[PDB]
Each structure stands twice: as C-alpha cells, then as structure tokens.
Amino acid sequence: KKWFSEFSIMWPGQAFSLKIKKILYETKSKYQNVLVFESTTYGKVLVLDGVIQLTEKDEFAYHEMMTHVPMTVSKEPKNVLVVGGGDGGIIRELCKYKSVENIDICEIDETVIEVSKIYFKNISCGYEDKRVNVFIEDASKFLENVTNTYDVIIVDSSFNQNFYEKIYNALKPNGYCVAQCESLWIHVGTIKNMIGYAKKLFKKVEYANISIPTYPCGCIGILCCSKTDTGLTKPNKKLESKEFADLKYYNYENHSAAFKLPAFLLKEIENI
Amino acid sequence: KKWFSEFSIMWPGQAFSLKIKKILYETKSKYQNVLVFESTTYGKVLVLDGVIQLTEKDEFAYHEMMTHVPMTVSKEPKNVLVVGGGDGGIIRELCKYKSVENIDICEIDETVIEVSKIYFKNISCGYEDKRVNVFIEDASKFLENVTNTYDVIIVDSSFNQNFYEKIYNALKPNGYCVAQCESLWIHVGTIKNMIGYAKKLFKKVEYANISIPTYPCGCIGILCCSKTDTGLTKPNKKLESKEFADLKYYNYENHSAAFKLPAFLLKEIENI
Ligand SMILES: CSC[C@H]1O[C@@H](n2cnc3c(N)ncnc32)[C@H](O)[C@@H]1O
Numbered sequence: 079k080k081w082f083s084e085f086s087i088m089w090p091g092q093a094f095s096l097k098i099k100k101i102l103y104e105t106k107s108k109y110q111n112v113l114v115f116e117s118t119t120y121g122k123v124l125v126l127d128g129v130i131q132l133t134e135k136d137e138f139a140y141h142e143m144m145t146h147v148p149m150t151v152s153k154e155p156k157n158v159l160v161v162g163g164g165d166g167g168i169i170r171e172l173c174k175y176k177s178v179e180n181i182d183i184c185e186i187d188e189t190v191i192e193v194s195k196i197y198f199k200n201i202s203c204g205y206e207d208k209r210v211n212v213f214i215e216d217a218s219k220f221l222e223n224v225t226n227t228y229d230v231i232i233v234d235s236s237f238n239q240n241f242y243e244k245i246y247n248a249l250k251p252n253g254y255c256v257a258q259c260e261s262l263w264i265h266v267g268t269i270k271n272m273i274g275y276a277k278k279l280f281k282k283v284e285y286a287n288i289s290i291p292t293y294p295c296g297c298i299g300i301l302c303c304s305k306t307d308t309g310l311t312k313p314n315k316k317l318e319s320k321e322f323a324d325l326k327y328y329n330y331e332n333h334s335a336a337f338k339l340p341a342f343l344l345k346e347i348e349n350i
Numbered sequence: 351k352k353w354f355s356e357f358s359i360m361w362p363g364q365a366f367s368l369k370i371k372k373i374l375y376e377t378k379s380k381y382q383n384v385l386v387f388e389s390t391t392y393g394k395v396l397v398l399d400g401v402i403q404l405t406e407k408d409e410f411a412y413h414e415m416m417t418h419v420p421m422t423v424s425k426e427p428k429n430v431l432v433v434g435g436g437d438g439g440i441i442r443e444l445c446k447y448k449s450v451e452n453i454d455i456c457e458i459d460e461t462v463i464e465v466s467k468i469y470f471k472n473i474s475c476g477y478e479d480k481r482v483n484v485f486i487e488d489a490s491k492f493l494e495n496v497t498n499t500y501d502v503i504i505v506d507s508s509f510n511q512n513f514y515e516k517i518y519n520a521l522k523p524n525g526y527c528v529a530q531c532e533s534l535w536i537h538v539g540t541i542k543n544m545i546g547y548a549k550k551l552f553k554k555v556e557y558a559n560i561s562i563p564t565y566p567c568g569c570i571g572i573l574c575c576s577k578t579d580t581g582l583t584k585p586n587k588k589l590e591s592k593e594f595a596d597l598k599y600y601n602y603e604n605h606s607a608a609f610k611l612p613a614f615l616l617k618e619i620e621n622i
C-alpha cells in the first residue's frame with residue numbers, strides 16, 4: 079500500500095500522512111487538483127491541491143463547531159450563507175435547524191460539489207434539501223452582488239480588508255460571521271492580520287479552536303465576528319430536538335470552552 | 351535534508367514527520383533507542399523507540415497542563431512524585447512552586463536524564479534544584495517500596511489495576527494523581543480501560559485534553575484521579591507570582607476548559 083503525504087510552504091518542516099487503501103478519483107479542475115481516496119484508518123479523504131480537505135473520520139468536529147457556534151447564538155436565523163464548503167458538511171448541519179428558510183452556498187468549484195455528491199454521500203446529503211440554493215462563483219463577486227442580507231455567514235474556505243467589508247454589508251444589523259482561521263500552532267501572524275481586518279468593522283471579534291487530527295498541527299480556529307458587543311462565546315439555545323441527537327463533537331459546554339485559548343495566543347492578540 | 355517519520359502499531363494508517371536540520375545524538379540504551387535531532391521548524395526533538403517524546407516548540411503545552419492542573423488544586427503540596435519524565439519538563443514546572451519541599455522523580459532510563467541535561471538545557475534545568483531527588487528504577491518497584499506519601503503524583507509515561515492501587519496507596523488522604531492518557535481520536539477503548547482501573551479506587555476520575563501538535567492526532571489526555579468528590583476541574587489558586595510570569599499555555603480559564611470533552615467521548619465513558 080502507498081501513503082498520501084501532505085507538504086506545504088504554509089507549514090514547512092512538517093508533514094502528515096495517511097495510508098491509502100484505494101485511490102478513488104483524480105482530476106485537474108478549472109481551479110485545483112482534486113483527489114479522492116479511501117484511507118486505511120480515516121475513511122474516505124478529500125484532497126485539494128495536495129491539502130487534506132476532509133476525512134470521514136473527523137469531519138464532524140470541524141463542520142459541527144463551525145455551524146453550531148453561530149447558529150446557537152443567532153436567535154431565529156432564517157437566511158444563511160455558506161462561502162466555500164462545496165463538500166456540504168456545513169450545509170448538512172444547517173439543515174438540522176427547522177427555523178432556517180434558505181441556505182445559499184457560494185462555491186467556486188462545481189467539481190468539488192459533484193465529487194462530494196458521488197463519493198461522500200453522508201456529507202453531501204444536505205444538497206437534497208429544498209432550502210439549499212447553489213451559486214457557482216467566486217465568493218468575492220457573489221458578496222459584491224448579493225441583494226439579500228444574512229443572519230449568519232459561514233466562511234468555509236482558506237481573506238483581506240475588502241472581503242470583511244463585503245461580509246459586514248451582507249449581514250443583518252445583528253448578524254454573525256464565522257470564518258476558518260489558521261492553526262494557533264503555526265500562523266499567529268495571520269490570525270493577528272485577520273483579527274485586525276475584522277476589528278475594523280465588527281464590534282466583537284473572537285477566536286475559537288477546534289481539535290481535528292487531519293488539519294495541520296491537529297487543530298483549526300474559527301474567527302468569530304459580531305456586530306453586537308455580546309459576541310459568540312455563549313449559546314442562546316440548547317440543541318435538544320431529534321435532529322441534533324446525532325451530534326458527535328458540539329455541545330453546550332464545548333461551545334464556550336473553545337474560546338479559552340493558550341496563554342501565548344492571548345498575549346499575541348491582546349494589543350490588536 | 352532528510353525527514354524523520356513516526357510510524358506505530360499504536361496509530362496505524364497515519365504518520366507525522368519533521369524535517370531534520372541535523373542529527374545530534376543516537377544510542378541504544380538498556381531500555382530503548384534514543385534519538386536527538388535539531389528539526390528545521392520545531393527546534394530540538396527527543397525521540398524514544400521511534401516515538402516523539404518532545405520538541406522544544408510545543409513541550410510547554412504538555413508539561414504546563416500536566417503540572418499546573420493538580421498543583422493549583424492541591425492546597426499546599428509539599429511532596430511531589432514524578433513517574434517517568436526523565437526530560438525534566440514536569441520538574442521544571444514543579445520548581446516554580448515555593449511551597450514544595452521535595453520532588454522525587456522515578457525514571458527507569460538514566461540515559462534520558464543525561465541526554466536531557468546535555469541537549470535540552472532549558473527543559474532539564476530543574477535538576478539543579480536542591481529539592482529534586484532522582485531514583486533510577488522501574489516506577490512499579492519504586493511505588494511498592496516508597497515509605498513517604500505524596501500530595502501529587504504525576505505519571506509522565508506511556509498502567510494496569512495493580513499500578514493504580516500503588517498510586518492510591520502512595521498518595522496522602524487528600525492526594526491527586528494525574529497520568530498521561532491517550533488521544534481521544536485514536537484510543538477510546540484504552541481511555542475507558544484506564545478510567546475503569548482508576549474508578550476502582552478513586553472516588554473522582556476525570557479526563558482532560560491538551561492540544562499539542564507533535565503528539566499523534568495533535569492532542570493527548572490527562573487522566574485525573576482524586577480521593578475527594580471535588581476533583582481536579584477547578585483551580586484553588588491563581589498563578590500570580592513572578593515564577594509563573596513565563597507561562598505559555600496554562601491559565602486559570604484553560605484549566606477548566608480542558609475538561610470539556612467532545613460529545614462522542616462523553617458518550618463512550620458515561621457508563622463506566
Ligand atoms: C470543500 S471546503 C473548501 C472549499 O472552498 C472553495 N473555495 C475556495 N476559494 C473559493 C472562493 N473564492 N469562492 C467560493 N468558494 C471557494 C474550494 O473550492 C473548496 O471547495
């Protein structure tokens with residue numbers, strides 16, 4: 079059996095590897111290289127430009143935290159935007175909320191969506207929900223053009239000052255944005271940059287950490303943006319209905335705990 | 351430049367790798383293979399039987415959490431035992447406490463201690479402290495023979511029913527033990543076994559998670575054992591004196607947060 083190994087200028091000097099049971103699909107799309115393989119121990123793996131996008135084993139950690147943090151804080155979210163997220167993990171978690179009326183997703187690469195529908199049925203299942211509307215376009219263009227405003231925007235992608243202005247303007251007065259935001263173990267300067275962009279517009283910017291083995295350094299953060307001084311560290315609801323019985327990572331207590339950061343990280347961000 | 355890669359039957363199907371700036375020392379000791387190398391991005395690395403023991407970049411996360419969790423809960427700890435811990439990270443954190451009168455360490459491999467004193471001076475610096483006494487022996491034998499009882503025992507090693515009986519008996523009536531205890535991402539069955547051994551004797555057994563990139567899956571847990579129903583989730587003191595000004599991970603809030611576990615883990619351990 080061969081091994082898949084992920085290298086990157088973004089995390090030099092380190093690599094993470096998974097053993098391949100079977101290579102399932104490869105293509106060069108208009109945007110990126112796409113690889114799908116069954117691993118021996120982490121289930122199926124989505125790889126984009128040589129970077130692990132997701133594995134069946136741990137994906138719920140990231141998709142649950144990213145979704146349920148803002149959605150338990152938003153009081154009655156009706157309209158939600160996912161930026162990126164072609165795999166449909168976030169959408170799957172969004173559909174659990176009966177109150178939601180519409181879910182727009184803007185993914186630039188339709189190949190990601192179709193590969194997820196074929197190879198990752200338990201991740202992409204939300205696409206069948208009638209509330210879900212797909213836009214195949216650059217989120218930068220989407221956000222300049224959208225007429226609606228959203229209760230929550232979830233940026234599920236690996237970002238500059240103009241981008242956060244567009245997110246701010248696309249949100250309701252009391253709207254929230256959460257965005258994927260680096261590992262505290264390797265890119266503190268980036269986290270500081272991102273926090274600085276966000277603070278230009280948002281009155282409350284907070285950072286949370288998710289434990290997930292197949293992201294570099296075994297963790298990834300959520301940059302949390304609020305228009306009210308109250309923020310996203312405390313949920314306003316418990317997830318008690320039958321739709322949430324299946325949750326594997328997220329709970330009421332973990333929500334708040336994820337904002338309790340290592341001392342080195344608080345020191346770095348304190349003067350921003 | 352070559353790469354160091356860690357493989358193991360303990361985490362099959364996955365591997366983590368660091369780039370080597372320079373190999374610094376190798377030997378087969380009486381107990382294990384020992385390797386020391388400067389990595390390109392994580393500083394110096396200690397490797398024992400092909401498993402990363404520590405890196406200069408992230409060691410403070412593990413040594414701070416393991417030490418300051420029990421030591422902020424113990425009211426006036428005088429006598430502390432470290433089991434394993436030859437690198438001296440725990441001892442370094444123990445010496446910060448003026449109240450401590452004695453620190454016994456039982457490490458089976460004196461080569462680890464001497465390699466740490468030579469190659470890892472900022473980790474092994476606590477060995478110079480006059481309160482520190484070294485026992486080169488199997489902790490199993492040490493614990494059967496010791497006459498003193500301890501306020502805190504820190505098991506810094508990778509454990510069975512008889513071992514926890516020995517720890518229970520080596521502790522004061524109000525004593526605490528914390529032990530290194532697996533990644534929740536790969537060895538839930540082990541965590542359940544360990545919790546089951548501990549609960550036979552200890553009235554309060556709790557599990558905490560530490561984020562640390564160079565442990566498999568980027569995290570490691572602390573099995574927490576208390577003789578009083580109150581447990582180890584809430585500190586009784588703040589670390590405010592000049593000795594703790596340097597802390598890089600541990601703080602008052604992170605202490606409690608580390609006990610807030612993913613929902614899948616609570617479900618697995620609930621019926622133990
Ligand atoms: C599957 S999760 C991350 C996703 O973000 C998508 N993505 C990357 N850049 C953009 C962008 N500018 N607009 C919309 N989606 C994007 C990628 O194609 C990937 O599917």
Ligand SMILES: CSC[C@H]1O[C@@H](n2cnc3c(N)ncnc32)[C@H](O)[C@@H]1O
Pocket residue numbers: 381398403433434435436437438456457458459462487488489490506507508
């Ligand atoms: C350096 S951290 C982990 C340490 O635990 C030590 N160790 C392993 N097994 C035992 C044991 N049975 N008794 C004491 N120390 C041990 C190892 O030699 C290593 O130095």
